[PDB]
Amino acid sequence: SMNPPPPETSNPNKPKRQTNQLQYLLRVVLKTLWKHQFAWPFQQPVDAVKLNLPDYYKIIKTPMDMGTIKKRLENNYYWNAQECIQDFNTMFTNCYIYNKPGDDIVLMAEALEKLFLQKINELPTEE
Protein backbone atom coordinates (compact mmCIF):
# COMPACT_ATOMS: atom_id res chain seq x y z
CA SER A 1 0.00 0.00 0.00
CA MET A 2 1.50 3.23 -1.33
CA ASN A 3 1.45 6.72 0.15
CA PRO A 4 -0.98 9.19 -1.42
CA PRO A 5 0.11 12.62 -2.57
CA PRO A 6 0.15 14.99 0.40
CA PRO A 7 -2.66 17.45 0.99
CA GLU A 8 -2.61 20.58 -1.09
CA THR A 9 -0.45 23.45 0.26
CA SER A 10 -0.51 25.66 -2.84
CA ASN A 11 -3.43 26.66 -5.08
CA PRO A 12 -3.29 30.04 -6.76
CA ASN A 13 -6.98 30.30 -7.57
CA LYS A 14 -8.07 29.53 -4.00
CA PRO A 15 -9.10 32.68 -2.17
CA LYS A 16 -6.88 33.36 0.78
CA ARG A 17 -6.08 35.98 3.40
CA GLN A 18 -3.89 36.94 6.26
CA THR A 19 -5.92 37.70 9.37
CA ASN A 20 -4.67 38.47 12.87
CA GLN A 21 -6.23 35.17 13.94
CA LEU A 22 -4.31 33.23 11.28
CA GLN A 23 -1.10 35.04 12.36
CA TYR A 24 -1.78 33.83 15.92
CA LEU A 25 -2.35 30.29 14.64
CA LEU A 26 1.19 30.37 13.17
CA ARG A 27 3.11 32.40 15.76
CA VAL A 28 1.49 30.92 18.86
CA VAL A 29 -0.43 27.72 18.11
CA LEU A 30 1.71 25.99 15.50
CA LYS A 31 4.96 27.21 17.07
CA THR A 32 3.94 25.87 20.49
CA LEU A 33 2.94 22.43 19.24
CA TRP A 34 5.86 22.10 16.81
CA LYS A 35 8.51 22.51 19.52
CA HIS A 36 6.91 20.00 21.89
CA GLN A 37 8.80 16.76 22.70
CA PHE A 38 5.86 14.75 21.27
CA ALA A 39 5.55 16.73 18.01
CA TRP A 40 7.72 14.52 15.82
CA PRO A 41 5.12 11.94 14.63
CA PHE A 42 2.90 14.83 13.57
CA GLN A 43 5.47 16.98 11.73
CA GLN A 44 4.91 15.42 8.30
CA PRO A 45 2.43 13.16 6.50
CA VAL A 46 2.21 9.65 7.86
CA ASP A 47 4.61 7.47 5.87
CA ALA A 48 2.53 4.29 5.77
CA VAL A 49 5.16 2.47 3.74
CA LYS A 50 8.07 3.05 6.12
CA LEU A 51 5.86 2.46 9.18
CA ASN A 52 4.36 -0.70 7.62
CA LEU A 53 0.76 0.47 7.91
CA PRO A 54 -0.69 -0.68 4.59
CA ASP A 55 -4.18 -0.04 5.93
CA TYR A 56 -3.55 3.55 7.05
CA TYR A 57 -4.76 5.38 3.93
CA LYS A 58 -7.50 2.84 3.46
CA ILE A 59 -8.92 3.92 6.85
CA ILE A 60 -7.89 7.60 6.98
CA LYS A 61 -9.49 9.38 4.04
CA THR A 62 -8.81 12.95 5.17
CA PRO A 63 -5.15 12.90 6.21
CA MET A 64 -3.59 15.89 7.90
CA ASP A 65 -0.38 16.71 9.73
CA MET A 66 1.44 19.75 11.12
CA GLY A 67 3.97 19.82 8.29
CA THR A 68 1.09 20.49 5.94
CA ILE A 69 -0.48 23.00 8.32
CA LYS A 70 2.89 24.77 8.70
CA LYS A 71 3.24 25.11 4.91
CA ARG A 72 -0.36 26.28 4.60
CA LEU A 73 0.20 28.99 7.20
CA GLU A 74 3.56 30.01 5.73
CA ASN A 75 1.96 30.18 2.28
CA ASN A 76 -1.07 32.11 3.58
CA TYR A 77 -3.22 29.32 2.06
CA TYR A 78 -6.21 29.73 4.35
CA TRP A 79 -9.21 32.05 4.10
CA ASN A 80 -9.99 32.01 7.80
CA ALA A 81 -8.97 30.66 11.20
CA GLN A 82 -11.74 28.05 11.20
CA GLU A 83 -10.16 26.32 8.18
CA CYS A 84 -6.86 25.97 10.02
CA ILE A 85 -8.46 24.93 13.33
CA GLN A 86 -10.30 22.24 11.36
CA ASP A 87 -6.99 20.91 10.00
CA PHE A 88 -5.63 20.51 13.55
CA ASN A 89 -8.81 18.76 14.68
CA THR A 90 -8.71 16.46 11.67
CA MET A 91 -5.12 15.56 12.53
CA PHE A 92 -5.96 14.61 16.10
CA THR A 93 -9.15 12.79 15.13
CA ASN A 94 -7.34 10.67 12.53
CA CYS A 95 -4.89 9.59 15.23
CA TYR A 96 -7.69 8.59 17.58
CA ILE A 97 -9.58 6.76 14.83
CA TYR A 98 -6.59 4.71 13.70
CA ASN A 99 -5.11 3.81 17.10
CA LYS A 100 -6.43 2.55 20.44
CA PRO A 101 -6.71 4.18 23.86
CA GLY A 102 -3.50 4.44 25.79
CA ASP A 103 -1.24 3.75 22.80
CA ASP A 104 1.91 5.90 22.91
CA ILE A 105 0.84 7.85 19.83
CA VAL A 106 -2.55 8.59 21.39
CA LEU A 107 -0.93 9.87 24.59
CA MET A 108 1.27 12.08 22.40
CA ALA A 109 -1.74 13.44 20.47
CA GLU A 110 -3.60 14.05 23.74
CA ALA A 111 -0.73 16.14 25.11
CA LEU A 112 -0.53 18.25 21.94
CA GLU A 113 -4.32 18.60 21.79
CA LYS A 114 -4.47 19.86 25.38
CA LEU A 115 -2.04 22.64 24.49
CA PHE A 116 -3.90 23.34 21.24
CA LEU A 117 -7.11 23.82 23.18
CA GLN A 118 -5.43 26.08 25.72
CA LYS A 119 -4.08 28.28 22.95
CA ILE A 120 -7.33 28.39 20.90
CA ASN A 121 -9.14 29.47 24.05
CA GLU A 122 -7.10 32.67 23.75
CA LEU A 123 -7.62 33.24 20.03
CA PRO A 124 -7.79 37.02 19.49
CA THR A 125 -10.90 38.73 18.22
CA GLU A 126 -10.58 39.37 14.50
CA GLU A 127 -9.22 42.84 13.72
Ligand SMILES: Cc1cccc(Oc2nccc(-c3c(-c4ccc(F)cc4)ncn3C3CCNCC3)n2)c1C
Ligand atom coordinates in the same frame (compact mmCIF):
# COMPACT_ATOMS: atom_id res chain seq x y z
C1 LIG B 1 4.85 5.00 19.32
C2 LIG B 1 5.38 4.97 17.93
C3 LIG B 1 5.79 3.72 17.45
C4 LIG B 1 6.27 3.55 16.15
C5 LIG B 1 6.39 4.65 15.30
C6 LIG B 1 5.97 5.92 15.75
O1 LIG B 1 6.14 6.98 14.90
C7 LIG B 1 5.09 7.41 14.16
N1 LIG B 1 5.34 8.30 13.17
C8 LIG B 1 4.34 8.77 12.39
C9 LIG B 1 3.04 8.29 12.58
C10 LIG B 1 2.79 7.37 13.64
C11 LIG B 1 1.49 6.82 13.88
C12 LIG B 1 0.24 7.46 13.71
C13 LIG B 1 -0.12 8.79 13.39
C14 LIG B 1 0.72 9.88 13.70
C15 LIG B 1 0.33 11.20 13.42
C16 LIG B 1 -0.93 11.44 12.87
F1 LIG B 1 -1.32 12.66 12.59
C17 LIG B 1 -1.79 10.36 12.59
C18 LIG B 1 -1.39 9.05 12.86
N2 LIG B 1 -0.74 6.59 14.01
C19 LIG B 1 -0.14 5.44 14.33
N3 LIG B 1 1.21 5.54 14.27
C20 LIG B 1 2.11 4.44 14.56
C21 LIG B 1 2.17 3.33 13.49
C22 LIG B 1 3.11 2.18 13.93
N4 LIG B 1 2.69 1.62 15.23
C23 LIG B 1 2.66 2.64 16.30
C24 LIG B 1 1.74 3.84 15.94
N5 LIG B 1 3.85 6.95 14.38
C25 LIG B 1 5.47 6.11 17.07
C26 LIG B 1 5.06 7.47 17.50
